[PDB]
From a paper:
The structure of CrypDdi1-RVP was determined by molecular replacement using the ToxoDdi1-RVP structure as the search model which has 61% sequence identity with ToxoDdi1-RVP. The solution had one molecule in the ASU with TFZ and LLG of 29 and 899, respectively, in the space group H32. The electron density corresponding to the flap region was missing. The dimer could be generated upon application of the crystallographic 2-fold symmetry. Similarly in the CrypDdi1-RVP structure, the side chains of residues Met203, Tyr205, Phe218, Ala223, Ile227, Ile258, Thr279, Leu281, Val286 and Leu289 form a hydrophobic binding cavity. The binding cavity in the ToxoDdi1-RVP structure has a width of ∼27 ​Å (distance between the Cα atoms of Asn379 residues of the two subunits of the dimer), while in the CrypDdi1-RVP structure, the cavity width is ∼22.5 ​Å (distance between the Cα atoms of Ser284 of the two subunits). The cavity in ToxoDdi1-RVP is larger than that formed in HIV protease which has a width of ∼19–22 ​Å in the open form, while the size of the cavity in CrypDdi1-RVP is comparable to that of HIV protease. Of all the inhibitors tested, nelfinavir showed binding to ToxoDdi1-RVP with a Kd of 237.6 ​± ​6.3 ​μM and saquinavir showed binding to CrypDdi1-RVP with a Kd of 242.1 ​± ​3 ​μM. Saquinavir docked to CrypDdi1-RVP with a binding energy of −6.5 ​kcal/mol in a similar manner as observed in the crystal structure of the complex of HIV protease with saquinavir. While the presence of HDD and the similarities in the structures and the active site architecture suggest that ToxoDdi1-RVP may have the capability to cleave ubiquitin and the substrates upon polyubiquitination similar to the yeastDdi1, in the case of CrypDdi1-RVP as the HDD domain is missing, the triggering mechanism has to be different and is yet to be investigated.
Numbering used by the authors:
A (entry chain A), B (entry chain A): 201 to 247, 257 to 322
The structure:
């Protein structure tokens, strides 16, 4: 079984978000943080946790959401969309249509490609 | 944020299933395996993995599904409903209604209680 991913822009960068209902908090790898020019945003008063990003822009389809990220030193996925965000947006994970419903957007999960 | 749980009977025992789209495989703790009289079912040709249960009965609402379990020595959750099962049943995680749609069943997630 392939994991669940959607396309998203975080702070205007196109990435692949691993959708994970078993995760309390949306998180991102330090390597991904670099790749999105987000290192400057990092509040280092948090801390293996690199830090916290209080405000970042999520672009999903043609919708825009503020969200927070926790940056980890090393992580298996680069970007992990968590339950925090899922519950906040009363998103629907429909594995019948194979898409994520988040407000007026319906975004398909990617195939292994 | 509270995690996602539903009520289910596995092999006629009432339990609380942690719903987790970020998990490839449905798994169960060794302690939970004991608590469901499932230790006998365990194929020890697998192995920290205690073993694999090839066939177990899931009762969700008034529906019945065969499923496999991987038994782990120690685990944070006791029973974890995975993507394997979610994708297999084209289940829908609706955090708008706060329920799991799996065929003709719609089961509510539990509150912190």
């Amino acid at each position: 079984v392939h994991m669940l991913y959607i396309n998203a822009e975080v702070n205007g960068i196109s990435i692949k978000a691993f959708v994970d209902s078993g995760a309390q908090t949306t998180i991102m790898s330090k390597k991904c943080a670099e790749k999105c020019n987000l290192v400057r945003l990092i509040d280092y008063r948090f801390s293996k946790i690199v830090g916290k990003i209080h405000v970042a822009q999520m672009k999903i389809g043609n919708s825009f959401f503020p969200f927070s990220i926790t940056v980890l030193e090393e992580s298996h996925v680069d970007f992990l969309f968590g339950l925090d965000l899922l519950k906040r947006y009363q998103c629907c994970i429909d594995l019948h249509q194979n898409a994520l419903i988040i407000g007026d957007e319906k975004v398909q999960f990617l195939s292994e490609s």
